[PDB]
């Protein structure tokens, strides 16, 4: 029941990443991909709790 808006660079390797996305550092967020011809396993699902 907590939301954390922390869109910073994830440090995976031992090399620090301060503002630069290196080989060992990746953004935690990745985008969606929606097409009308997609199947059941790729269709959007609007979820409310």
């Amino acid at each position: 029941f907590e939301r954390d808006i922390s869109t910073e660079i994830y440090q995976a390797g031992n090399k620090p990443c301060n503002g630069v996305a290196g080989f060992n550092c990746y953004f935690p967020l990745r985008s969606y991909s929606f097409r009308p011809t997609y199947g059941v396993g790729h269709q959007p699902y609007r979820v409310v709790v």
Partner: antibody, heavy 132, light 113 residues
Framework: QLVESGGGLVKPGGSLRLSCAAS????????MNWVRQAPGKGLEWVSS????????????YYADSVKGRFTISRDDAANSLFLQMNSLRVEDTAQYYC???????????????????????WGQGTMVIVSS | DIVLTQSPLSLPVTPGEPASISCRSS???????????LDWYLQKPGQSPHLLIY???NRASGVPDRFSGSGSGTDFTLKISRVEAEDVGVYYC?????????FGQGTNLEIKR
């Protein structure tokens, strides 16, 4: 960037409507910018924008002339970046590249100067002419 | 503003011979962080520029291993192991600071047939 609109003959006292379009891409979480180029060798960065998801949008970087006469806005709903101006003193030939920065995270950035990583999404298709 | 001129002419490059282009920055870099902050670009005329080397000494955007930047401080340079017909285009070194972003002059590196 795949296709962009805008272009034609505009009087120096007129205004231009610049818009760059693209395909399915992370438009929201990337920082875009406008760069114009001379017919000879050499580009010239003319505008830039921030991203609302990372932080607030009150970190826009401007030069003197483009603060005086230019502005940049984003729709925040689709894949479209908008550049607007009102006054044209000396602007004959330019390309208005709809590039973007390779920085999905914003750190140690103020409203004056902070580094950017790289540009890899240059776009072409906007030609400007002034002659009537 | 940093004064920055690369080579405001056409530099002949013979095939099979390495070519190097150098630029110097009036202001010291690396003030924001320990990593070097300068990007290398290649702009072939007609369609679109292509990115080769980003900040530091690394590789990205599918750059061939022939391109390799080097140098630090007020001494910057490139190195291409083998030039090709697709290597024709203007080059720029661009530091990631100085928000009034002034640009340098491109260098033509056409193959000397």
């Amino acid at each position: 960037q795949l296709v962009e609109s805008g272009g034609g003959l505009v009087k120096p006292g007129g205004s231009l409507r610049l818009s760059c379009a693209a395909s399915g891409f992370s438009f929201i979480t990337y920082n875009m910018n406008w760069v114009r180029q001379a017919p000879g060798k050499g580009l010239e960065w003319v505008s830039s924008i921030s991203s609302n998801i990372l932080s607030s949008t009150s970190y826009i970087y401007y030069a003197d002339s483009v603060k005086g006469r230019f502005t940049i806005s984003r729709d925040d709903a689709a894949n479209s970046l908008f550049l607007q101006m009102n006054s044209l003193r000396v602007e004959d030939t330019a390309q208005y590249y709809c590039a973007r920065t390779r920085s999905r995270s914003v750190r140690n950035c103020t409203s004056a100067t902070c580094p950017v990583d790289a540009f890899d999404l240059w776009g072409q298709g906007t030609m400007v002419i002034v002659s009537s | 503003d940093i004064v920055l001129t690369q080579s405001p002419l056409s530099l002949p490059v013979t095939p099979g011979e390495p070519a190097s282009i150098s630029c110097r920055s009036s202001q010291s870099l690396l003030r924001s962080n320990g990593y070097n902050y300068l990007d290398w670009y290649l702009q072939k005329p007609g369609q679109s520029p292509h990115l080769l080397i980003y900040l530091g000494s690394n590789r990205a955007s599918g750059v061939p291993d022939r391109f390799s930047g080097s140098g630090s401080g007020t001494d910057f340079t490139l190195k291409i192991s083998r030039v090709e017909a697709e290597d024709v285009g203007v080059y720029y070194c661009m530091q990631a600071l100085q928000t009034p972003y002034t640009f340098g002059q491109g260098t033509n590196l056409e193959i000397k047939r």
